[PDB]
Amino acid sequence: ALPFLPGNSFNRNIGKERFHKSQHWGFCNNVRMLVSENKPGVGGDLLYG
Amino acid sequence: MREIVHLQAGQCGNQIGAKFWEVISDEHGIDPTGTYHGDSDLQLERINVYYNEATGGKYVPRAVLVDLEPGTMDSVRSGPFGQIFRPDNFVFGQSGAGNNWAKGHYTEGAELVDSVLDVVRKEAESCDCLQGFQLTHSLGGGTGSGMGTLLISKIREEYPDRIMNTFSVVPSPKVSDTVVEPYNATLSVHQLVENTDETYCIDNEALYDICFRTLKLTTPTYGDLNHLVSATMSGVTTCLRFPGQLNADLRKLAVNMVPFPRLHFFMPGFAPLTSRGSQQYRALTVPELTQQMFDAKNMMAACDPRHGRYLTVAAVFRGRMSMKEVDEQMLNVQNKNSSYFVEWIPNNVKTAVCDIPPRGLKMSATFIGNSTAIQELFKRISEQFTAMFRRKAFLHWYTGEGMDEMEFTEAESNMNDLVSEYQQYQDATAE
Amino acid sequence: MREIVHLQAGQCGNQIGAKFWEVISDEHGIDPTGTYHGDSDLQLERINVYYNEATGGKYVPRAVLVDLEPGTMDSVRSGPFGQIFRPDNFVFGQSGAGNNWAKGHYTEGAELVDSVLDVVRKEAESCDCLQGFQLTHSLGGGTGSGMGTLLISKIREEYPDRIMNTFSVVPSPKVSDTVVEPYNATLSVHQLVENTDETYCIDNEALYDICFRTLKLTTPTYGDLNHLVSATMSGVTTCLRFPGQLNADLRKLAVNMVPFPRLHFFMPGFAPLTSRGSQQYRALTVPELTQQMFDAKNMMAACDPRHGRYLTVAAVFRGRMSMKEVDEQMLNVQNKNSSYFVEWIPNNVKTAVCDIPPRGLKMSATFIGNSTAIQELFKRISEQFTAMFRRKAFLHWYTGEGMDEMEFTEAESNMNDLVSEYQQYQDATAE
Amino acid sequence: ATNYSANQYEKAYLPTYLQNWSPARPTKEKIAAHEGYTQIIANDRGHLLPSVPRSKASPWGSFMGTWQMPLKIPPAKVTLTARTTTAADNLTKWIHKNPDLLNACNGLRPEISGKP
Amino acid sequence: MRECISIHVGQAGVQIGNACWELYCLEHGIQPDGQMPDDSFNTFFSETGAGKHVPRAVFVDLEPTVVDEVRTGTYRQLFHPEQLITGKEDAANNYARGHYTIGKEIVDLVLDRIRKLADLCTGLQGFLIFHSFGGGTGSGFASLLMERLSVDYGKKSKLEFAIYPAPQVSTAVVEPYNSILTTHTTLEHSDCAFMVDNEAIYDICRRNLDIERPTYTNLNRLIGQIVSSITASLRFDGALNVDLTEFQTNLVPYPRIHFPLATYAPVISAEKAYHEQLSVAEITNACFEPANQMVKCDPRHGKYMACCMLYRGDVVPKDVNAAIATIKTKRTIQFVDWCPTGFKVGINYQPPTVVPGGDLAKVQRAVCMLSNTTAIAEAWARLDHKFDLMYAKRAFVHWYVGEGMEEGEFSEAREDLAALEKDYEEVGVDS
Amino acid sequence: MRECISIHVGQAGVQIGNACWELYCLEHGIQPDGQMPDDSFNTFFSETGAGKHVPRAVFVDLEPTVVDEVRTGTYRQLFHPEQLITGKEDAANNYARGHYTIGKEIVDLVLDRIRKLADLCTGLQGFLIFHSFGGGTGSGFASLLMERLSVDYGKKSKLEFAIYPAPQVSTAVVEPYNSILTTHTTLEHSDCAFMVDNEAIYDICRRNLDIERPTYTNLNRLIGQIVSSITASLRFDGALNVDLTEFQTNLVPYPRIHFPLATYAPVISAEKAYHEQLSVAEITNACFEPANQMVKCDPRHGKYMACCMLYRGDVVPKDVNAAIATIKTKRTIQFVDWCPTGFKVGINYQPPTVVPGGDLAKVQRAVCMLSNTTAIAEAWARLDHKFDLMYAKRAFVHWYVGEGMEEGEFSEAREDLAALEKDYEEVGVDS
Ligand SMILES: Nc1nc2c(ncn2[C@@H]2O[C@H](COP(=O)(O)OP(=O)(O)OP(=O)(O)O)[C@@H](O)[C@H]2O)c(=O)[nH]1
Ligand SMILES: Nc1nc2c(ncn2[C@@H]2O[C@H](COP(=O)(O)OP(=O)(O)OP(=O)(O)O)[C@@H](O)[C@H]2O)c(=O)[nH]1
Ligand SMILES: Nc1nc2c(ncn2[C@@H]2O[C@H](COP(=O)(O)OP(=O)(O)O)[C@@H](O)[C@H]2O)c(=O)[nH]1
Ligand SMILES: Nc1nc2c(ncn2[C@@H]2O[C@H](COP(=O)(O)OP(=O)(O)O)[C@@H](O)[C@H]2O)c(=O)[nH]1
Ligand SMILES: [Mg+2]
Ligand SMILES: [Mg+2]
């Protein structure tokens, strides 16, 4: 419960496992795009929204 | 009115740029969805400087995230403020350079630089009056140090009068994370002296010290490092967004920091950094703010200014201060240590005051300083480059791109006239 | 305003200063937390002399703790008044000097001299009008006697006119706790005699004498000893912190005490020291102060002034008294004991009165006397120096540090020139 | 190879502060500038040209093992404070007897202080 | 996006394939049937209509029985039947039979199968090609494969993991003839190599993991860990992501010297982790202990020209720079004169997973190091010694001439290695 | 931070290490598994990745069975397995095999384990080294390790606890040869010594501890008490703490005289302590008694040159000084002329702990003493007497020469000890 400032930040990554990454972005029909809006974030967990 | 287009290049540029946008978003009260949730009216009086309007009361950063490798940008997408950036701004190729300046500037950059130019030319023509662009990258890489330099080369031809700043990261002496670092460093600064209004030299190893001894963090990750550099990029354009007793902007330092067009390498530093045990024993005053500002440990570059002479100084301030005190300190520091300040310019220092402090803090300040101690960073890099380039080490990768050997020869030559012309001004008589 | 930066070097320097900061915290009503909980106004009127200010009604001492071994600093921080000190002011290396003056003054004491110069420069420029500095150390040690002499030689060059006191500890003949003690004591007075404004010669066996005989403590710890020394360090500057009928300071005593620049060694002494039983039969009067004041067994050095001539004498009284009785009592001892006062200076005694008594006590006084009976100390050391130095013993430790041998020969010469110069003012004709 | 200077931050990288409690590499505190560019000194595959002068040092470093190291090594700490004139000399000659030991990377760099 | 194809060759390559491709199933959670019971597996697997994921691998051998075990093991349904390519008759420890007579039969078939894996992927990053210098297929056919892969893909990376002959033990007599000839191909048709002999891992396993009676399945697992940490930054996010093209540029100073050395640490058992603290200092010193290189050579007798570091797990830029700086301040290490900054640093997030039935304990941080050194020059001198004394009297030559290659290749192959040994010497001479 | 590494060598080293480290666990509170059910323990123990404290010790022996008794003892889990280093075959009472042939085998391995231990230390004070003059491994290897330790660690102290052979009793015939040869090698590669012969501890335990049939454990407990009090000032606070550097400088007056004599007091039984009060004066007179030295030499046959005092328990600084004054005023204790002040006093607070089943009754106060004197020169005289009459007939030297050391090394080694006696003569002569 702290205001955002240099030195006021604590990682939540301690003890978190499965730092997997999704394949957001990528080419379809030779066009750069965000392929699929429904992929989860890092950790295989749902994003915001 | 006065808009800033935030350029961005490479992994260093993206992780710096990802932290930067959330930092001013807290300043302007923009939630991860993107809508206004702040309270005060001055939090919406100059939001068009960085944000672009979209339907439904949404604010869109005027960012252009560029990277040859598509996968650094999904980590940008998967962050807290991930879905605030428009996907059409994301530009990426298919094959990276691999710390190879030659790949990113000549062969694979030339295929990607068409598409980014369409983005910025759309962003430029959107706003009425641009103040100028702003790019964050690193000199020891392949895309930011590579393509990112060809971008700056092209904009200055198109847009000669607008300003163009760079919060670059220069490689460090003690620890190096790339063996072809001095090859990319010299091939890049040669571009920076020719087409750039301002450059800010940041070194991660100088950021490493401050997290250790001034904040006393036990495990400072790269997020805290990216927080420090973003706290500086906020401090330079803050008077452009909030009112002040004594106003300033990005051009007000440009004319006033650069005595000759070749010398635009400055050394930033952030004042109100105190360890969480030191907050108990301190006093929030302006005399303390100038004391920590000018201390050589507080610098975020890799050279001691006590070796050289301070050409010009710019100290911008935040928070509602009394202006006798912010003026008597700067006369005090110019007088007491007269040897470190050049004589042919009396009154080397520039001051500015912004009433609105950073969010959650009472008083703050940001230091910009031009000194003849940056020359060691070129002197050290040059001989780190001569010792490598003599033996034709790692040259087949670079000469396999078809470039001749004489660009390197004119790369060190344009580095080495600088250090001579930099050193002449240090050894200059007043009368 | 009129400030003092308390230096602190070595194990003796720290445990003396840890008691000293506790002593004056009670006078100024400071809790272990660091806030003011006193009652009278005068307890917070001139607190800026020793304490720096901070947010929240907090006061941090203006102290600089220095030690080469971290072991002494840990026990200071773990005391009751251990968290009061600011964490930045702690400065310390990794390995000790091992009672080697040469090790502490040249080889490792030099790596630590850059940082202690930064903290001292930090505290010196905060205070607007710095009266001077103050150091406490021991001459038989490795860092207090060692690096502690290097600081003095450096700070004099930067701040020449400012006063420089040292409450050093001189070795004792009857029992010695260091074998190589004569070498460090000789090589440091030679620093002291050139670079010092006043010097107090506190001796531990004299303190052992007082605790056993005067106060009659069965078990006097070193804390009780450190109470005795501090009770003098308060009395030198009490006229600086509280108003009185006739004020003084360091410079009023310094100007009036040393008739020649070479001779600045005095003996302290504290007047109202009574045992437990003796307290029943007493009556607080000014003559009872003076009777114990000049008694030779109250001295905290190992030299009896009945063997020499009192060059000039100070007495700083503390309490609400009469200016007639204080003046008549320094008159009576100046006439009864005619021979022990020099003949070429009339009225060899300097007096001052401060109204506010020490806390919990009604009346007190402090003794600072300069006499020729202090050459009894320097001749005493030199015999223990030439005895060891004839056989070149305990020397490979010293000459292995890279120092040469003429330093010992001149240091004895400067020491032996001093006593020959001290002797001639004992045997002096007026007319 | 060459260790440069962090200038203000050199205290952070001293050998003992980095928990390396052995003899360590030197620090190049000052450097000069080179006017103009530099000529190519090696051909392809990193071979030096015929015309350039080369060092006489061994191309494979200089490291001594236990069986290669001399059987009677004088100490590093030598202090001539009370030695007789000849006892000073046999110690000094003893150190200088084997030039290979002092020159190796793992070999000791002695300290000598004082005169008999 | 990033995708890689593994081109495992030979009985060495196939058995390595079982160990690594099991590890890629546990890392991603793929069941042995081939479905996940989130798109993080595209670089190695590839999905189909049925939801199954087929590996991006091509197992090749010239004899059936090793691959036949794979076709009926646990993962029989995991692999596509078409990619496990075999042959009716093998080379039988013969380069010529595996390069000119039997290889040309099935060369065309596999070059069609590689293309049918190439077109599925959009962004190819490179080919990881695994073979052995000893056997006929791993030496002969794998040498043909690189020759025909060079022409079809000019720019694509071709990584070459290899098993080099052990200095003392070898399971073949004619093997030095095999090793000499194939080094033509891995000199001009390869980009990087990772030669590793088994006797070093035999020594490392029994010294560190306490397994006194190892087997090839024990050895296959550590090689699976080495390839895993190479592509981890490609697979999961990191503070400093390092790509395949990154460390190809920053490991090879000259096109003929592209032969780095692998080094993995920590490699310790579960009992030996119960007593031992693991910190980034304690494992990065292990990368430079000469007892842990997976080739029997000592870097203390040579000098490093490039070192690439691959961190993984709970690691901080705190400890990375402190450990690297401590490495540099060591007189034991030797760097070539032209390479002052010879470090490439990669930091990843996902800690290494543990296979059940393995030997290592599960740990929070690890490292892999790739160090091009000139101390490998000693390996060829012994190799050219043994090839010399066999070829001086024409032993085993009738086997190779009968297959249908000229004997002039034998003498020519000896001279190229004769020139290559002098190459590793001239980089050792400083000016 | 105060830290010591123990390098115990040989059966005497291992059996002393069992008794010494059993004291340290009970002293801090570590359970035998390694779990503490205060950072003070860092001087000996090191925190790990499970919550343990593993010692900073290196047990080495050339015969396995002495170390195997540790590996199956109570403390099998406290010690890290890597630290206990053994070998197949032992030196078998032979300097040559311990120094040139079989000692050289494991000199590389134990140097690596020491390096890793020294890497973990933050500030290491020195190296504590326990061995014997009699055994081949305790003398031959320890001489080789000392010589190779100095080149690796030039400045750091190398203390030598050791077992000097007896005048009358003996476990060996050849030990005059082994004891002569090791002082010549270690005369220039050592800093201090505390030689203790076993009969001198044997008679003390008989006379004072009632144990008329002692064993080596009762001696090893007493040896541990000496080592406990030396490092006590590092572990817990005191009024006057001492280091390892402090007492090496004040006990070695000349470069070749580094053989003090240890003494402990009080040592009385529980039934004998009931009748006798123990004060400071009582036990400090016991430290000078000829009947209580653990070297069989009466210092009435010589003169003290330096005395190091180590007080511990319920002790008062005033009573340490009243004791020393009495000690000086008695010509039975005679001092050299060139050391008028020959004392080095340290004061510690924590009373010494008692192991259950031991010998000493637990006591409130205790004293330790390290007195360097020339009454050891007679001990060298009898050793040359035992070295001569064996050397005339060239007995036993066929063993030494057959191992690989020349006979000319026998004559030079005895010649140096011929000079060392004359060294001990000149300092004992008064001018
Ligand atoms: N490190 C390691 N080496 C292996 C392994 N399996 C086989 N080898 C090596 O392979 C060599 C023998 O050649 P192979 O690869 O088995 O056979 P090949 O390549 O198909 O050639 P041919 O036998 O003629 O068919 C031996 O020298 C081994 O060193 C393994 O699992 N690990
Ligand atoms: N004080 C004491 N002395 C011991 C102890 N153990 C052995 N010694 C002495 O050590 C001498 C023999 O050397 P050891 O330590 O037993 O054996 P070593 O050092 O391994 O040398 P080698 O026997 O040749 O292998 C004997 O003469 C004993 O006096 C012990 O526990 N305490
Ligand atoms: N300050 C900072 N520097 C970074 C960060 N990430 C990488 N770097 C620096 O960037 C350099 C490598 O960047 P690189 O990925 O090669 O940039 P690119 O080639 O343009 O993609 C290294 O020297 C790092 O020190 C970060 O998050 N913060
Ligand atoms: N009077 C007094 N003397 C002290 C105290 N603490 C230490 N000393 C003296 O300091 C001397 C040793 O100082 P030392 O530790 O060697 O100083 P350092 O080497 O600079 O750390 C001893 O002779 C002690 O008598 C104290 O609290 N009071
Ligand atoms: Mg085969
Ligand atoms: Mg033995």
At position E344, the amino acid (one-letter code) is: K
Output DSSP code: residue B369.
E
> Is the peptide bond preceding residue E266 cis, with omega within 30 degrees of 0?
yes
Closest by CA position to E285, among listed F112, B301, B6: F112
Residue C138 Cβ < 6 Å to ligand 4: yes
Pairing label, strands E59-60, E84-85: parallel
Q: Could you tell me the sign of the dihedral formed by the alpha carbons of E209, E214, E219, E220, in that order?
A: negative
Residues 6+ apart with CB under 8 A from B351: B246, B315, B316, B317, B326, B327, B330
Residue F206, token pair as written in the block = 């008989």
Q: Which helix (H) or strand (E) covers residue E264, if one does?
A: strand E262-265
Query: The tokens 């710390």 sit on which residue?
Result: B99
Identify whether the C-beta of residue F17 lies closer than 8 Å to the C-beta of residue F59.
yes
Counting runs of H as helices and runs of E as strands, what totals does chain E give? Answer: 17, 12
Query: Which residues, 6+ apart, have CB-to-CB distance to C263 below 8 Å?
Result: C311, C370, C422, C425
Q: Find out whether E423 and E257 touch, Cβ atoms under 8 Å.
A: yes
Take residue E301 and report the two structure tokens written for it: 């007798």
Residues in chain B with CB shorter than 8 Å from the CB of C34 are: 281
Residues B175, B231, single domain; the answer is yes
Mutation target vs F (from D19, D21, D98; most F CBs, 10 A cutoff): D21
- The strand order across the sheet containing B265-266 reads B91-92, B63-67, B3-9, B130-135, B163-166, B198-200, B265-266
**Bridge partners, residue F261, by sequence:** F371
Distance from CA of B211 to the nearest CA of D (A): 13
Helix (H, G, I), strand (E, B) or coil at E397: helix
What's the token pair of residue F400? 């030494």
Chain E hits for D44, Cβ within 8 Å: 254
Residue B299 φ/ψ, nearest 5 degrees: -60, 145
Whether D114 sits inside 8 A of C396 (CB atoms) is yes
Sheet arrangement for strand B269-270 = B269-270, B364-371, B310-318, B349-354
Evaluate whether residue B430 is within a structural domain: no
What's the rounded Cα separation, in Å, for the pair B93 and B66?
9
From chain A, which residues contact E within 8 Å (Cβ)? 13, 17-23, 25-27, 39-40, 42, 44
Beta strand pairing call for A31-33 and A26-28:
antiparallel
Instruction: Tell me: do B82 and B134 sit in the same domain.
Output: yes
Phi-psi region of E47 (alpha: psi -120 to 50; beta: other; left: phi over 0): beta
Classify residue B62: in a domain, yes or no.
yes
In terms of DSSP bridges, do strands C51-54 and C58-61 run parallel, antiparallel, or are they unpaired?
A: antiparallel
Binding-site residue ranges of C for Mg(2+): 69
F93 lines ligand 2 (CB under 6 A): yes
The number of beta carbons lying within 10 Å of the beta carbon of residue E95 is 29
**Does residue E36 belong to the interface with chain B, where contact is any CB pair within 8 Å?**
no
- Nearest CA to B53 out of B69, B34, B76, B68 is that of B34
C150 C-beta neighbours (distance < 10 Å), count: 20
Three-state DSSP at F175 gives: helix
Rounded Cα–Cα distance for residues E45 and E87 (Å): 26
Helix axes F216-230, F10-28, angle to 10 degrees: 60
Mutate to test the pocket of ligand 3, among B7, B8, B12 (most ligand atoms within 8 A of CB): B12
Question: Residue B140 domain-assigned?
Answer: yes
| Beta pairing partners, E149 | none
Q: Tell me which ligand sits closest to the C-alpha of residue B185.
A: 3
Residue B405 Cα, gap to closest chain E Cα (Å): 16
- Tokens 């903290």 locate to C119
- Residue E118, H or E segment: helix E103-118
- The nearest CA of chain F is from the CA of E283 a distance in Å of 11
Torsion-angle region of B59 (φ positive above 0: left; ψ -120 to 50: alpha; else: beta) = beta
Same domain? For B314 and B349 the reply is yes
Residue where the block lists tokens 């080739």: E295
Rounded CA separation B406/D104 (Å): 40
> Which residue from F62, F242, F82 is spatially nearest to F135, judged by alpha carbons?
F62
- C430: in domain: no
* Residue F22 among the catalytic residues: no
Residues contacting F379, CB < 8 A, separation 6+: F164, F167, F295, F296, F297
Determine the number of helices (DSSP H) and then strands (DSSP E) in chain C: 15, 12
Residue E220 assigned ligand-binding role: yes
Backbone angles phi, psi at F129, to 5 degrees: -130, 115
Reference B52, options B147, B127, B162; nearest CA is: B127
Q: Are residues B148 and B274 located together in one domain of the fold?
A: no
Q: How far is CA C251 from the centre of its chain?
A: 15
Q: Among all chains, which residue has been given the structure tokens 């006239």?
A: B417
Q: Can you tell me the distance from the alpha carbon of E4 to that of E233, in angstroms, rounded to the nearest whole number?
A: 13
Out of B231, B257, B283, a domain closes at B257
Largest Cα separation within chain A, whole Å, is 46
- List the one residue out of E203, E313, E211 whose CA is nearest residue E271: E211
Taking residue F235's Cβ as centre, other Cβ atoms within 10 Å add up to 21
Q: Based on the domain organization, do C305 and C396 belong to the same domain?
A: no
Q: Looking at the complex, does the CB of residue B283 fall below 8 Å from at least one CB of chain C? A: yes
Q: Environment class of residue C40 by beta-carbon count within 10 Å: exposed (0-12), middle (13-18) or buried (19+)?
A: exposed
Given a contact cutoff of 8 angstroms between Cβ atoms, the answer to whether C13 and C144 are in contact is yes
A22 CA to centre of own chain: 8
Integer Cα distance of B385 and B390 in angstroms: 8
Q: Does B277 touch chain C (CB under 8 A)?
A: yes
CATH number at residue B389: 1.10.287.600
Is the CB–ligand 2 distance for residue F139 below 6 Å?
no
- Cβ(C292)–Cβ(C365) under 8 Å? no
Which are the contacts of C305, defined by CB distance < 8 A and separation ≥ 6?
C267, C296, C299, C340, C369, C371, C373
How far is the C-alpha of B145 from the C-alpha of B99, rounded, in Å?
9
CB count, 10 Å around CB of C113?
16
Are residues C155 and C7 part of one domain? Answer: yes
In whole angstroms, what is the distance from residue E340 CA to residue E336 CA? 8
In one-letter notation, the amino acid at residue C397 is W
Task: Using the structure block, give the residue that is written with the tokens 């959670």.
Answer: E29
**What resolution, expressed in A, was reported for this entry?**
3.5
Choose among B72, A23, A44: nearest CA to E44.
A23
E240 lines ligand 3 (CB under 6 A): yes
Judged by its nearest atom, the ligand closest to the C-alpha of residue B17 is 3
- CATH at residue C310: 3.30.1330.20
Both C156 and C11 in a single domain? yes
Q: Residue F398: which residues within 8 A CB-CB, separation 6 or more? A: none
Size of interface C-D (CB pairs under 8 A): 25
Per-residue H/E/C for C162-199: CEEEECCECCCCCCCCCCCHHHHHHHHHHHHHHCCCEE
Q: Are C282 and C273 in contact (CB under 8 A)?
A: no
Distances in Å between the alpha carbon of C148 and those of B49, C6, C166, C260? 57, 13, 10, 24
Regarding whether C398 and C362 lie in a shared domain, the answer is: no
CB pairs under 8 A between A and B: 71
> Which residues does C347 contact at the CB level (< 8 Å), separation at least 6?
C334
Amino acid type, C186: T
- Taken in order F165, D73, F108, E198, is the CA torsion positive or negative? negative
Tokens of E102: 């039997």
Amino acid letter, residue E106? I
Buried b (16+ CB within 10 A) or exposed e, F396-428: ebebbeebebeeebbeebbebbeebeebbeebe
Domain limits for position C321:
265-374
The CA distances from residue E197 to E56, E164, E296, E386, F47, in Å, are 27, 5, 7, 17, 36
B280: region left, alpha or beta (phi > 0 left; psi from -120 to 50 alpha)? alpha
Which residue matches tokens 């130019």?
B117
Among E331, F166, C187, F341, smallest CA distance to D25 is for E331
Residue F139 contacts residue F172 (beta carbons within 8 Å)? no
Roughly how many angstroms between the first and final C-alpha of chain F, as a whole number?
44
Domain closes at, from C225, C257, C289: C257
Q: Is the CB of residue F263 less than 8 Å from the CB of residue F255?
A: no
Tell me if residue B50 falls in helix, strand or coil.
coil
- Neighbouring chains to E with at least 3 Cβ pairs closer than 8 Å: A, B, D, F
- The amino acid that residue A47 corresponds to is L
Tell me if E373 sits within 8 A of E154, measured CB to CB. no
CB atoms within 10 A of CB F46: 17
Distance between CA F71 and CA E95 in Å, rounded? 52
Strand partners, E366: E312
Query: Residue E372 pairs with which residues in a beta bridge?
Result: E306
Which ranges in F49-190 belong to alpha helices (H)? 64-71, 95-96, 107-120, 136, 142-152, 175-186
Measured between beta carbons, the chain D residues lying within 8 angstroms of F255 are 79, 81-83
N-terminal to C-terminal alpha carbon distance within chain A: 23
- Token digits of residue E169: 């033990």
Closest to E343 (Cα-Cα) out of E309, E293, E302, E311: E309
- CB within 5 A of ion ligand 5: which residues? E 11, 135
Is the separation of the CB atoms in B154 and B135 below 8 Å? no
Preceding amide of E176 cis, omega within 30: no
C-alpha of residue F179 to centroid of ligand 2, in Å:
13
Task: Tell me which method was used to determine the 3D structure.
Answer: cryo-EM
How many helices (H) and strands (E) chain D has is answered by 2, 2
Of C221, B70, B328, residue with least CA distance to F349: C221
Classify residue E389 as exposed, middle or buried by CB count within 10 Å of its CB (0-12, 13-18, 19+). exposed
The response to whether residue C177 sits with its C-beta less than 6 Å from ligand 4 reads yes
Question: Do C36 and C185 belong to one domain?
Answer: yes
Q: Cα–Cα distance between B257 and B262 in angstroms, integer?
A: 12
Contact B62, E236 (CB under 8 A): no
Report if residue C30 sits inside a domain.
Answer: yes
Ligand 3 centroid, distance to B103 Cα (angstroms): 17
- CB-CB neighbours of B263 under 10 Å: 20
Are the C-beta atoms of B371 and B309 separated by less than 8 Å?
yes
Distances (CA, A) of C118 to B151, C83, C85, C311, E357: 44, 22, 17, 39, 59
CA distances from B321 to B252, B359, D46, D102, E245 (A): 21, 16, 62, 64, 53
- Is C196 in the same domain as C317? no
Of B71, B86, B229, whose CA–CA distance to B143 is shortest?
B71
Question: Which of F281, F52, F104, F295 is closest to F197 using CA atoms?
Answer: F295
For residue D56, give every residue at least 6 positions away whose Cβ sits within 8 Å of its Cβ, in sequence order, or none: none
Own/partner long-range contacts of E206-213 (Cβ < 8 Å, ≥24 apart) = E207/E291, E208/E267, E208/E268, E208/E269, E208/E272, E209/E267, E209/E268, E209/E269, E209/E359, E209/E360, E210/E269, E210/E271, E210/E272, E211/E359
Interface contact B306, partner C, CB < 8 A: no
Contact F125/C at CB under 8 A: yes
Domain co-membership, B286 together with B410? no
Looking up tokens 């002790």, which residue turns up? F315
Place of tokens 């428009």: B86
Mutation target to probe the D interface, by most D beta carbons within 10 A, among F100, F151, F405 is F151
User: Which residue, F48, F136, F149, F133, is CA-closest to F379?
Assistant: F133
Indicate yes or no: CB of F339 within 8 angstroms of CB of C177: no
Q: Which residues pair with D112 in a beta bridge?
A: D78
Instruction: Tell me how far CA of residue F119 lies from CA of B267, D23, E282, F124, F344, in angstroms.
Output: 36, 13, 8, 10, 32
Is residue C302 assigned to a domain?
A: yes
What is each CA distance from E384 to D5, E178, E423, in whole angstroms?
A: 44, 12, 15
Phi-psi region of D69 (alpha: psi -120 to 50; beta: other; left: phi over 0): beta
User: Hey, what amino acid is at D109?
Assistant: R
**Long-range contacts of C35-44, Cβ-Cβ distance < 8 Å, separation of 24 or more:** C35/C59, C42/C242, C42/C243, C42/C356
Contact B131, B249 (CB under 8 A): yes
- Asked if residues B251 and B354 have their Cβ atoms less than 8 Å apart, the reply is no
The CA-based diameter of chain F, rounded to the nearest angstrom, is 63
In a domain, B31, yes or no: yes
Widest distance between CA atoms in chain C: 64
Q: Is the Cβ–Cβ distance between E349 and A16 less than 8 Å?
A: no
Partner residue opposite A23 with nearest CB, options E1, E28, E236: E1
d(CA F54, CA F80): 6
Domain with residue B216: its CATH number is 3.40.50.1440
Q: Whose CA is nearest to atom 14 of ligand 4?
A: C141
Number of domains in chain C: 3
Closest-CA distance, D15 to chain B, in angstroms, reads 13
Hey, whose CA ends up nearest to atom 14 of ligand 1? E135
Among B222, B257, B292, identify where a domain stops.
B257
Alpha-carbon gap, residue A3 to B359, rounded angstroms: 8
Domain membership of residue B345 (yes or no) is yes
Task: Tell me, yes or no, whether B219 and B306 share the same domain.
Answer: no
Break-preceding residues in chain A (C–N over 2.5 Å): none
Q: Which residue's CA is the nearest one to ligand 1's atom 7?
A: E12
8 A C-beta contact, residue B380 and residue B302: no
